[PDB]
């Protein structure tokens, strides 16, 4: 990583980046990050860029939370991949400053979890995961504009999507064209 | 595993008076083969009761079944005996045996509790397989109601957690008719 | 983990405006740290908050009670804030948070539930484990109910197995004070 | 490996079994209570009133495998002689005890173990206070039968059992885990 | 990671602290720690010999030679070493919690304590296990004597608590004289 | 191995017992039950035990030890290749006059050896047994070779290689078996 | 292996015995049960050992050279394949006259190998023994081979491979069995 | 992990500014190098004044302890050598090696005593080099251990056969160390 | 490691003293040869000290430390602490003439070169030769250095060679053995 190593000299012009799985670590780094931003300037625009395959739910639900909590709008810009946990956060971008650079890729499909144990642990566990599949698909409806009966039915499996069917489905805003 | 002279290994010697011998954790190998011997002694003789011993642990309950299943469908009593401990789908089976014909030895060990599984994967695959092994755990609490005289409400509660029986206690149950005190 | 030059890793710059980042799990090391934090941020200045902000699985125990104990004795009230998830011994110290000034943000999840552990050897090694964590959950349960206002009754019920909560919920039951939301 | 006798064939346990002798020469599991308990229903059913001699060589092993063993030895009418040849040790010197009232042997140089059960807990801890009650309740019955078998109290078993206790042959026959020793 | 303090200079936590005479035995004693915690006595003791000294044990023990390292050097040095658990003291971490200065050892309410006899092993020859049982043995009896010394406890009644694991509260390790006073909140 | 019977079942029934590995509660279980099947076949005719181990488990060895010693029949001992450790306790234990080497023979004499792990006392324990099995090997070993207990006990503080002959002059064997 | 008997059963039906392995307890232990089976079948008639073998355990290949010296018939050793270290010690020790290699056949001879961990005096045992061990060999190679211990020494200080002719020049076999 | 004092020095380096080394490892190579490298900086920085080597080490290579315990000779400052926790092996062997009068241990200090360790794996000759290594390398330590506790070396090879533990106490009176430094 | 006001490695450096103290791989020999060169630049006339423990290592490692020794001008003085084995004992040889010493309980060993060789004949044969080369290229250097005839190094390597410092000079490995 070159020498500020490059991302610091990006966090000094407000530029976040996202580009890995997302776990507890990156969001405490990124929900760190938001915070510093709004501290330096409470008005200014915030960029969020988005190369990322997913992971935590609860760890991307930091990072949301913490974007909707702030003063300053977050732009989100998918550039590479927003799948899963990723292409959530891309959509949880200010209205109007969500975008995707043209051969990006955004991929929706259902949580992924476990459950091991009794036969009670197991159902906890099952309700545990379709109430978080339930609280996404609500979130992901008001910022889209979908229905929770088309995102259910479009999550159900993989669903890869351009940087143009990603606009038509309300994740992002616009294509930045170069 | 001794030879008993024509020559046969002990288990298969057994066999030969209509006994079978439950001695490991109930998977689909162990399953096919008490099922392979219980039908074998049905043809023997319909009508000349079966011994079943049951020292296990439990296991696979689909495997259980094929035991549980076959028992409930031959015609000869088949009696059961649990010597050292019968835990889980093997105190299942132990309750199956013929009404009257449940026995346990002075200080065998019974254990029942919820069955356990898993699931990996996407929400509605978890959903899939909790549904299923909820109807799964639904299905033996009636059949053990049935067969003990306890509520299904009780079984729930009783199993909720691993709970160990003494014989006696076993025997207050209903998940067996007769401690066998030796002579 | 980027620098932000004035040089500080984020972290360190969030600690110089008396924010402690508890983001992993909980074991002696993330204890000993966060320990070291608050009592530095006390000498820094004795009556301004400190803000403990929680996305944490849980861990140990003791780990998890270091940290409590020294919440408590110090002077600056320490805010607690959920960010995702607090679990177990995550809630726990969520709880612990000066009254008043305990937060999640909407999306966040709280789960509580009974410790767990582990004993193995001689029966007389057994009986002092299990004594040992039984112990450890009446004082754990005594806690929460005195942070609450819940009965211990109710604590011990609710917490027999894993319990999820919304942060809504989490108010409602008296682990935090107020849900975050936003302008 | 094990060699054959031939008379029809035998493998050497085989033809020990023929004259009413099993051999517990390994650790206790399942598989090996499933076999010797087998024996005993076997020899009852070839003689009812001959007594059998059950050698005893063993580690010791699982409590409710040995309790299998137990519980089939006081089931049948023969009269089991145990003999400790080697080591007893754990559940092994438990099934030496368990012998027909003036049948238990040990060989001068042989010797006996008795210690506490061991065992493991893992999980909730409504979970762990289960596995210990049940581990508690599981030494409580073991001592209480070896008090019977012994002569000796509860309480000095329990003392007695605290942690590994060896004791020679002729230790044991004094303690009433044997009848004998068997001098050459 | 341990994050930075700027006061200008710069320091790890752990370094700010112990610029307060603030130690951290906060993980297994090994000889690494023992060697490291020696050197921050040693040092503090230089700045200054009148000034208490605080060492914070959040320890499951370890090493009993490394502790004793610990254990030397704390009575060798003319400052006060208070001691004050905070989490776990168990085995070697809660024999040096007992050495602090008398009337400065300290727990905070939640604490635990345990104490136990001394693990070990050995392999090989009859007259080599032999060697190893009469050092562990001797081990032991040179621990006990200092437990009885600074609790006030009989060897004969601490041989007995150590025989198994003994957890006390912060409360308990108080009566039995391991800490002088629990540190409760204001 | 060949059949003509497997070789070794050939031999038993010439009241040959082949001792021919390491010496574990499998191989001490088989040989206590050749030895008794051997007195019930015939309870006057000698019995050749040959041995050729590494030694092995102390208790594995003292049940065939004390059913030697209980069994009617005269176990005669000979020891081919090497007996050491628990294989060269159970070479002194054939019957006197009848315990024998082949010339190349080797016989190797040591403490046993053992392990112990856990709390102090469990150590103890543990130490104690070793030591009180350490004296009772010693005692049976000075019965049979004619040596003293303090003999035996520096003898043995380090592996001791003897050569047939000197087997026989220690006692442990009668004579060396000369082609 | 096919049926006809087992092969090797049915050779040793003929009086062969098959030496085709590293030599272990397991294989000594066999082919000395095997010599003493042939004996009690016939004590006059030749018996033929069969050698492919690397080596192995010296004690091992000394219960063998001991059981063949000890025993009645002559055994005849016949090296086909290679004769390795104590192999080619067991194809040496054949009946006088009696021990051969077949023409492209290989014999290596080699000083022992083996290892010592531990404390000093440990380690000096084990040298100790493993010297001594040596000069045996040695000794009894110069008897069955003529050459002197000294030239024996020298010519085992590292691997020396021989075809079957120089095997016959320096006295571990008779004669090549040419075709 | 390793504390930081600012005058910026880790702990180490601030205790070798006031001439104290600190051996609180296994003996190996890396250990030897670092120890040597910092007695010829302090003998550079003042050749008059002590040096403290403060030891807590289970022992380890033998030629690295050589390589420390000839650095301590050569240099012209005395080395005071001080055993807390434990001394043993080659760690025993340089706590002996310190300036005669300035050998220290404090009381509940461990030093243990045995003859070296190693192994051999090859042909016999091979297996004679090693062990003719060994026992000049044990030779050799003797002589020394000799020289510096004033007690024979028939004494050492005796009381060095197995492992010896001594107290700081029994350590004086062997002449491993000069005084037991007991607490004001 | 600890530092002086530079970490002490880098302090001894300043005073023209280089630690070979660990098995000599390319690593190693890279950082000496930079070592010998920096040192020859700042002063060319001023001797440089090498202190060497090492139990030896790649031979073209080792050879990669002898030729920068032999062309620079300064003198490299070598220094036995420990032992120097294998490599390590013909670096220790290669000083400069009077200025090659050990410490009294120094270890000095002596042995032919170590290698592998696995595939076909021909390739077995190609690595045969290179490592008996290797062996005769080792020992002529050393019959130079140490005023033995090569036939008298070739038996004297054959196996383990364990000398003490005085025989090291005798041997005339060294020059002299540092007495304190
Ligand atoms: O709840 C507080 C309030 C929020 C706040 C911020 C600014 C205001 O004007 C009012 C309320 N809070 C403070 O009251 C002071 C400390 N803090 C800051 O945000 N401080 C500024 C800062 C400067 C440099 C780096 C990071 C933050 C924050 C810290 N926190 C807790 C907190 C901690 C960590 C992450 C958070 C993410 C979202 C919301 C709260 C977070
Ligand atoms: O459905 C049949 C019928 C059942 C039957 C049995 C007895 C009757 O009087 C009437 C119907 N069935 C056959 O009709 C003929 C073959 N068979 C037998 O049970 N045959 C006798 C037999 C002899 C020896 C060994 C085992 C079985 C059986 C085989 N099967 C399939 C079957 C196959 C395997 C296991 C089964 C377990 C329970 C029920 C049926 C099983
Ligand atoms: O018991 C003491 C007292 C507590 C104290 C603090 C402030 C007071 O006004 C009165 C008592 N103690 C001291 O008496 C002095 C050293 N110390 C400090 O807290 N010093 C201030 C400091 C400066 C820079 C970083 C960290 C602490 C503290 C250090 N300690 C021990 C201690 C050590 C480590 C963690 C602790 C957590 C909670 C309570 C005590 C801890
Ligand atoms: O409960 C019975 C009765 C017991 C019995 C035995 C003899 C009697 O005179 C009366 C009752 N039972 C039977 O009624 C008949 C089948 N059986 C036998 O023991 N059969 C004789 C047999 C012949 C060949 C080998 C083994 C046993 C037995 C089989 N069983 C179940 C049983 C099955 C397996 C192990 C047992 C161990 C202890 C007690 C019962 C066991
Ligand atoms: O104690 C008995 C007595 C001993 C006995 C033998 C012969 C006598 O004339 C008197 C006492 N015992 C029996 O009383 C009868 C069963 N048994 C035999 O040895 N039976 C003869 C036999 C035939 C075929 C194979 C093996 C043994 C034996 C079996 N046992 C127990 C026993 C079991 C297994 C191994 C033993 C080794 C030594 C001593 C006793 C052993
Ligand atoms: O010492 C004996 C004597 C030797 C003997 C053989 C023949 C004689 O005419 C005289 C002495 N010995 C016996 O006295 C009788 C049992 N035995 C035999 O060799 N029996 C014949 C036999 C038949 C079938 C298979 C193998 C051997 C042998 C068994 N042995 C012990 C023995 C056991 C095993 C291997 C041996 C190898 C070499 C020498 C003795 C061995
Ligand atoms: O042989 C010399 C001489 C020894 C010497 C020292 C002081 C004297 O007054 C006379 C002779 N030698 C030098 O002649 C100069 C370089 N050197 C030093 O010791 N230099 C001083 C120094 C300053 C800062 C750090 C370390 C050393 C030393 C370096 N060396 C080689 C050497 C190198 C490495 C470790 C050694 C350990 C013991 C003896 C010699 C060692
Ligand atoms: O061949 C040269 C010449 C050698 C030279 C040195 C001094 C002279 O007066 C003349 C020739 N050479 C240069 O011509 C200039 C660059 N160089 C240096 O040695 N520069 C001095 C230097 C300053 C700081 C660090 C290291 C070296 C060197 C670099 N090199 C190549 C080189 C590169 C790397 C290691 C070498 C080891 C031995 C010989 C040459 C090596």
Not at 41 to 67: C, H, Q, R
Not at 87 to 111: C, D, T, W, Y
Request: proline share 3%; net charge negative; aromatic share 6%.
């Amino acid at each position: 990583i070159p020498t500020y190593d490059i991302y610091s000299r990006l966090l000094k012009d407000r530029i976040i980046m996202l580009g890995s799985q997302i776990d507890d670590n990156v969001a405490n780094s990124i929900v760190s990050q938001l915070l510093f931003l709004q501290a330096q300037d409470s008005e200014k625009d915030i960029y969020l860029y988005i190369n990322s395959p997913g992971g935590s739910v609860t760890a991307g639900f930091a990072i949301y939370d913490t974007i909707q909590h702030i003063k300053p709008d977050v732009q989100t810009i998918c550039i590479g991949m927003a799948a899963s946990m990723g292409s959530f956060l891309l959509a949880a971008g200010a209205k109007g400053k969500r975008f995707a650079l043209p051969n990006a890729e955004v991929m929706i499909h259902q949580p992924l979890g476990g459950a091991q144990g009794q036969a009670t642990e197991i159902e906890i566990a099952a309700n545990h995961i379709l109430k978080t599949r339930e609280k996404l698909n609500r979130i992901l409806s008001e910022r889209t504009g979908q229905s929770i009966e088309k995102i259910q039915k479009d999550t159900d499996r993989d669903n890869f999507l351009t940087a143009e069917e990603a606009k038509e489905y309300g994740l992002i805003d616009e294509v930045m064209v170069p």
